[PDB]
């Protein structure tokens, strides 16, 4: 059993409130789940407003961004799931902003609250394929210059469909189709039977 | 040295 | 095009692989846009694929110069989603090769940070002491580097029958190889310059473009996640932040000199004050059960198979957990479904921050001083490329 | 005897063509290997060079695709034993210099017939020997004519077995293009005949490999002797000046007797060490390429050959200097065709 | 508890120190000292070939599959070597041995994709597939790499003594 | 005056794609010739480098006539 | 006297003088770079051998492939090892090299370097331990002393 | 239905966007065959523009048209400042690559599943 602080539960709730009744406009759901974090789920609008009030408010210091992911519910009408971690020095404390973002449906940037975003952006960018409007420099960072597709989306295939080799009659390296000598063996591990919930 | 014994 | 010139992927200048490419106006470097991605492999994709367990190897491979502190951040971040928490013995231990590691790292900062500046002889002096180090990886582990010791319910297996005791030779010694690079480097009236004034990071732009790392100990910011947020047992230890002061190249460089000082005050507690106990939780529901008990009880086989063909099962829900590996915050956000394996596993990256500021940091300076600062920030290709 | 093709295609794939290739290591060859090790086919590459020569040709192949083989002409037991698990064997054994130790008949009648000759004890389903095209067994250069005098053996030895007589090739590493592009070291640059009265049709390599490689997998083709030639026939005048037009290099055709340019080819031969020109390539490069009345090969065998002037750019970029590096084809003037 | 790294009157003696320090280089000249010292310290090489750096028991180093005393193949295809494998590398398929007892028809380690992990060494309940000694396998061919039943099976027979020495120093900790 | 229409006429031959001599002053990139619609900006930008003028992203959108395309160039 | 002999001997040398001064180009990619770092190290000198620390990629005989060889720096790879010399080799280091590694399934990772560049010796394991890797250089200096190129011209 | 718009409001503005990038591309096709060094003919790079601009001439949508030059925009970009090097602009040519028939008989006779 974890060493649960029950003293931090609470205090982490308090803000939830806090910043749920100074936002009333953004916040959708506030939850301080076990293993004690905090996480303010919030109308994409939203993306601005509420990281600079977290970024600079007194009772709220935010100052580093730890992160900012997009987990990928191919079921959820909103595809991603950006999640924004941030961390305070002055309270020592973490929160968590998460959004929802659909394909085609892009969400603010916020290189401006903090520049740490610059480069994960362009990374949810070039895994996920969200859009980030007023981004400085929006462009892939971590895939190869010609790669079509994005990554990590779970609709991708692992392999990809690509694959490069040296050919001498052209002298030049050259994709192909992907095709593999041993197939991923994709073992199915889910058990057909579940574990009463605590 | 896996084994000081000869 | 200003005479842009990328800085080349092959340079034994440049880490592993960074193309940068770089306008300079002759010698001095007007705009820094540094290339990633020459080392992405997929390591947030495979993991989706594979289970908690089979997913413990590709955490040693994120940073590697870091093998073991990398696994601890995953490890912890599997506990908190189970509610289970290691063994006494074991978190000693991690806390014990955690610091080792950390050592390992800064041998490594600090010295391949020479190479490139010119100096040689550092790295061949401290190398020598990597080495023996590696040894102890192996006599615990069974390899030099990618260990998988730490698994996500403790560690793998005791620790050999005298390994203690060596970990103390070295330590009792590796104080005075620190001191000599010390007078070969920390003085010299051409470290300094070359280092000094270079790449200075103001306190507010560091905690703004995310650093977390040395390179806000630099600047005199406070913060260590390991006194700020104890993991492990680095709570019931006493070490001192090396915190720094006109923030540049030198003063992170003696910043990290420092650590690599505390963290033998933290080995050597740890030596003293190590528990007699057992190194994985004892619920053979997470970890896998002794060799003898499940060649001699059905519970046991049972809890081996399962464990070893489909997992964990971790309870659903998401944590993001991060330690102070030695190059600064590395945190695994892990969203984990019921099911075995994982759904998402972001790993966060000091480093992915870091390059980031060369940007902000190499301004108006010479192509020599871009050395420097890749140096300064202890980039390592692997965690930032994941 | 074997091996249904599964697979879509590409690298990876089977396409159930075990096939020995002699003189793979060849400008051709290389050719010859890319296509079969693309297709999936099981290429056996007999060797006599050194294993770091061979080695450009691993990396085209799939694992376990490429097999290479030690051998030796005059020893027969080599032979015998690479045609021993292949069902096709393909001879591109051929050289322009007499060698000490290997003479035109050699390279090019002897060897190839013994090769056949043990294919057939072996039971290999086809031949494919490859033999300069016009090459009449009257032919000046003694190299065409030895040439002929194998085509004919070959026969003998084994029946129905396939015989691809391509025109001199247009490739990059060949000679045809490169040779007169090479004549820039000479301030002058001999032409018999001022370059006319020899119309040459060159034939890209790849068409030449792909027509080599269909054949093996082609039913239509036995005792057939196809000839790969080209999409344009050229007098050597604007050859020799387009060549030297891309290469960016001043031109100056000069008469010299073919009997005393004869004389130069003897020289160079004499030289030890692969002579660049040699009195029968002489000959050879001013026996004007002949008309085409025989078995047709590209398209006919399924690839539509391609036009000199397209890939040339590719061949001939090395030559150029430091600026003239970087200027393309269709800015430059392609050069008149005359099909005489 | 914090610490300042670099956190910081000029009198003759206190300035002619100094000139002196950037005049005559007196600092390069300590430097200087270090590695004249080392010269004469002993090197820490080893003669590669005669001597061999040492590992200890649990050295993951190269896979082998191990067999009964008796003469039994261990292996006995649960094939949960496959299932943990990280990289995929194990390909195993079975079928009854004629003898009715279960066995491998094919095992096939791809050492390339391997990263030795060392779990299959781990996973095996007979233990039959084990993390060998050497480190030394460096083929010059890809193929070679690749591993199939017979080459782990030889693999076992040659390291067995050593393998067997290992397993017996080390399974008290497992 | 004519001589912006001599050149124009000059640039919309050229290209070969269009005007096999059906080339007309009147004649409409998209109304009558049929020239795509990206074809036609491939015409515009053509008459770019002849004029040595280059045409905004609009008003290419405004002219599908060489004639009128002459009307604004002679502005 | 017979030039036969003469030629093996000279070639004898020859292979002498390349395979003792081995000048090894090393990439570094990936992590199994520390692990040769560690050759260049006190422990296991490569300079004792004639390996020198490192070279640029001119200068260099040998290139050695540590770590995974990415979609992107594949064309580089090339690139690089087509600017050596006339004499060069190349020694494979890692399981991420020989073949894909840990992340051979990969979209990203070329599945071994042999794909990209001909390959004389591969080195295995994932941190293929820095014995090993001299091992390997150590059966690059086999392989090339059994190299016979002047032999070969003679009997050719 | 319901949209927000990300670029344009309608596909009108959307095709302004694509009209610009194609212009973009055409001026740019000239250049990169020469500071690339590529053994293709502008002419025919020129179509492959072309190609690609109409391989996605069916969208409907504004929004998609909109992504579609933002992704198109960062390649020329990649392009341009030779980002993309000689072997990744070739690519799009499809050259090594053997191409396949779509008659269904041609299949037939090759692969199993078409
Ligand atoms: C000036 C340039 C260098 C001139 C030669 C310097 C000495 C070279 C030499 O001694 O070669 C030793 C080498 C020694 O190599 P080796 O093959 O005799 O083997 C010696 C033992 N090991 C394998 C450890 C090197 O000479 C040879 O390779 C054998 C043939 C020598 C033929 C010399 C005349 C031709
Ligand atoms: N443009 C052309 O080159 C034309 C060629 N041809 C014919 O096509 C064939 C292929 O041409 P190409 O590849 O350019 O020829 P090459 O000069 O490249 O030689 C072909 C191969 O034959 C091998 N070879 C040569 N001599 C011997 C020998 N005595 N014993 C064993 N092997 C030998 C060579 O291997 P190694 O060098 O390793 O000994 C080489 O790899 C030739 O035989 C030629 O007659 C026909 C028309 C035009
Ligand atoms: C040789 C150089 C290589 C350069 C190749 C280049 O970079 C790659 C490329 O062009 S990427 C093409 C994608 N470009 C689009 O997707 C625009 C789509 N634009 C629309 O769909 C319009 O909204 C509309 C509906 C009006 C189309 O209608 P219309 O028939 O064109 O008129
Ligand atoms: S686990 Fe041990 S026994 Fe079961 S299959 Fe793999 S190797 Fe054979
Ligand atoms: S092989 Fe193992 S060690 Fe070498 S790079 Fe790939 S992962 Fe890191």
Known sequence: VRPRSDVTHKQLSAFGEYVAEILPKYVQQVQVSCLDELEICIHPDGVIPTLTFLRDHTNAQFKSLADLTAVDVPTRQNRFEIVYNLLSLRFNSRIRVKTYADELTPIDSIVSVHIAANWYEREVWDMFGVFFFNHPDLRRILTDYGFEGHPFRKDFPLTGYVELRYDDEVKRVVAEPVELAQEFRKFDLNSPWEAFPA | ?6 | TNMTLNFGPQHPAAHGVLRLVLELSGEMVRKCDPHIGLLHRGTEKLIEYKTYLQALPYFDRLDYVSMMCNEQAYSIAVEKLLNIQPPPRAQWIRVLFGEITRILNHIMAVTTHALDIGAMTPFFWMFEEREKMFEFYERVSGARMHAAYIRPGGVHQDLPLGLLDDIYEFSKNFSLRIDEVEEMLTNNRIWRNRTVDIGVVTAEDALNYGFSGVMLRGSGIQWDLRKTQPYDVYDQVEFDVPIGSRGDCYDRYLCRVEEMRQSLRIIEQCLNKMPPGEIKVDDAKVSPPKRAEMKTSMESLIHHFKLYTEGYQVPPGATYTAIEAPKGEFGVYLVSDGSSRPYRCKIKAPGFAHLAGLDKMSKGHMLADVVAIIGTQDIVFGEIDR | ?340 | ?174 | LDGIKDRVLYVLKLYDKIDPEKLSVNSHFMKDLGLDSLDQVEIIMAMEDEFGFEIPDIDAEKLMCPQEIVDYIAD | ?156 | ?114
């Open chain 5, 1 to 174: 508890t914090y610490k300042y790294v670099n956190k910081k009157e000029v009198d003759m003696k206190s300035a002619t120190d100094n000139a002196a320090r950037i005049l005559m280089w007196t600092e390069l000249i300590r430097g200087l000292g270090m590695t004249l010292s080392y010269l004469f310290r002993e090197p820490a090489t080893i003669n590669y070939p005669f001597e061999k750096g040492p590992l200890s028991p649990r050295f993951r180093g190269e896979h082998a599959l191990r067999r009964y005393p008796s003469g039994e193949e261990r292996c006995i295809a649960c094939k949960l070597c496959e299932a943990i494998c990280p990289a995929q590398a194990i390909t195993i398929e079975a079928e009854p041995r004629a003898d009715g007892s279960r066995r491998t028809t094919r095992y096939d380690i791809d050492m390339t994709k391997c990263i030795y992990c060392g779990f299959c060494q781990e996973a095996c309940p007979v233990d039959a597939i084990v993390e060998g000694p050497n480190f030394e396998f460096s083929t010059e061919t890809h193929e070679e790499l690749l591993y199939n039943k017979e080459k782990l099976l030889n693999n076992g027979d040659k390291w067995e003594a050593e393998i067997a020495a290992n397993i017996q120093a080390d399974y008290l900790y497992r």
């Open chain 8, 1 to 114: 239905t319901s949209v927000k718009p990300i670029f344009s409001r309608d596909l009108n503005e959307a095709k302004r966007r694509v009209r610009e990038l194609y212009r973009a591309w055409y001026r740019e096709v000239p250049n990169t065959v020469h500071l690339m060094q590529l053994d293709i003919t502008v002419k025919q790079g020129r179509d492959k523009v072309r190609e690609m601009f109409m391989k996605n001439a069916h969208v409907t949508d504004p929004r998609v048209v909109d992504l579609l030059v933002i992704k198109g925009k960062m390649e020329l970009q990649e392009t341009i400042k030779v980002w993309k090097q000689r072997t990744h602009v070739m690519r799009f040519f499809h050259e090594t690559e053997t191409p396949r028939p779509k008659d269904f008989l041609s299949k037939f006779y090759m692969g199993h599943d078409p």
């Open chain 7, 1 to 156: 006297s017979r030039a036969e002999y003469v030629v093996t001997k000279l070639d004898d040398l020859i292979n002498w003088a390349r395979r003792s001064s081995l000048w090894p180009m090393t990439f570094g990619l990936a992590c199994c770079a520390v692990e040769m770092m560690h050759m260049a190290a006190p422990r296991y000198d490569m300079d004792r051998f004639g390996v020198v620390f490192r070279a640029s990629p001119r200068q260099a005989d040998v290139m050695i492939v540590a770590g995974t060889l990415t979609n992107k720096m594949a064309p580089a790879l090339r690139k690089v090892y087509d600017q050596m010399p006339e004499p060069r080799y190349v020694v494979s280091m890692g399981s991420c090299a020989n073949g894909g590694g840990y992340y051979h399934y990969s979209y990203s990772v070329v599945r071994g370097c042999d794909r990209i560049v001909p390959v004389d010796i591969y080195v295995p394991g994932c941190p293929p331990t820095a014995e090993a890797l001299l091992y390997g250089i150590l059966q690059l200096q086999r392989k090339i002393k059994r190299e016979q190129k002047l032999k070969i011209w003679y009997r050719r």
């Open chain 2, 1 to 6: 040295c896996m084994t000081d014994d000869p």
């Open chain 4, 1 to 340: 005897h074997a091996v249904i093709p599964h697979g879509k295609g590409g690298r990876s794939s089977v396409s159930g063509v075990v096939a020995t290739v002699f003189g793979a290591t060849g400008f051709l060859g290389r050719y010859v290997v890319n296509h079969l090790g693309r297709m999936g086919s099981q290429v056996i590459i007999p060797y006599r060079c050194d294993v770091y020569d061979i080695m450009h040709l691993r990396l085209m192949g799939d694992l376990g695709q490429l097999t290479f083989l030690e051998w030796d002409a005059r020893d027969k037991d080599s032979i015998r034993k690479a045609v021993q698990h292949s069902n096709v064997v393909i001879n591109l054994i051929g050289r322009e210099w007499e060698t000490r130790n290997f003479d035109f008949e050699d390279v090019f009648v002897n060897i190839p017939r013994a090769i056949a000759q043990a294919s057939k004890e072996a039971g290999v389903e086809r031949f494919i020997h490859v033999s300069h095209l016009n090459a009449s067994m009257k032919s000046s250069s003694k190299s065409l004519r030895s040439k002929a005098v194998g085509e004919k053996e070959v026969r003998s030895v084994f029946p129905e077995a396939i015989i691809i007589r391509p025109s001199d090739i247009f490739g990059r590493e060949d000679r045809f293009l490169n040779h007169f592009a090479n004549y820039r070291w000479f301030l002058a640059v001999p032409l018999v005949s001022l370059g006319f009265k020899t119309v040459k049709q060159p034939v890209y390599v790849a068409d030449v490999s792909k027509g080599i490689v269909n054949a093996t997998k082609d039913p239509d083709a036995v005792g057939k002797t196809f000839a790969f030639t080209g999409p344009n026939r050229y007098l050597l005048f604007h050859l020799v000046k387009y060549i030297f037009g891309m290469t960016h290099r001043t031109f100056i055709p000069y008469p010299l007797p073919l009997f005393v340019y004869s004389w130069i080819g003897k020289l160079f031969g004499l030289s030890p060490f692969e002579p660049w020109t040699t009195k029968d390539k002489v000959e050879r490069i001013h026996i004007s390429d002949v008309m085409p009345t025989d078995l047709p090969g590209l398209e006919d065998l399924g690839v539509q050959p391609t036009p000199l002037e397209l890939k040339s750019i590719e061949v001939l970029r090395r030559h150029r200097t430091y600026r003239w590096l970087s200027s393309e084809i269709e800015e430059t003037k392609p050069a008149k065709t005359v099909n005489y």
